[PDB]
Structure 1
């Protein structure tokens, strides 16, 4: 046939990091628990799901994308 070609630089795919992280809640002394990172307002999110914190952005990931709640 032809047998190869192309400039250089194969592309990579993705990770999903590592993240031991679903520990974001704060317990005071014995035992009271207060939540970090405010949860989400859509009827598809039972407010067990939270909103990512960037800048401007807070965003719902259980909705795979949808919605912009910005506080």
Structure 2
């Protein structure tokens, strides 16, 4: 046929990063628990799901993307 070429640089993938995560939540001196990061007022996401903290940006990942709550 022909075989091969490449001006180079192959494309990669993704990782789902790492993170021992949900440390986010904080409980005081025995044993009251206060949530850090605020949750979602979409009926689909019964307020377990949180909003990621960027800039302007607070965002529901559970809603696969859906919705832009901003505080």
TM category (shorter chain) comes to over 0.9
1:20-59 equivalence runs, <5 A? 20-59=20-59
- Structure 1: tracts of 5 or more residues without a match: none
Aligned to 2:66: 66
Residue 8 (structure 1) shift: 0.3
Q: Please provide the CA RMSD for this pair.
A: 0.6
**TM-score using structure 2 length:** 0.97
Moved over 4 A (4+): none
Q: TM-score normalised to the size of structure 1? A: 0.97
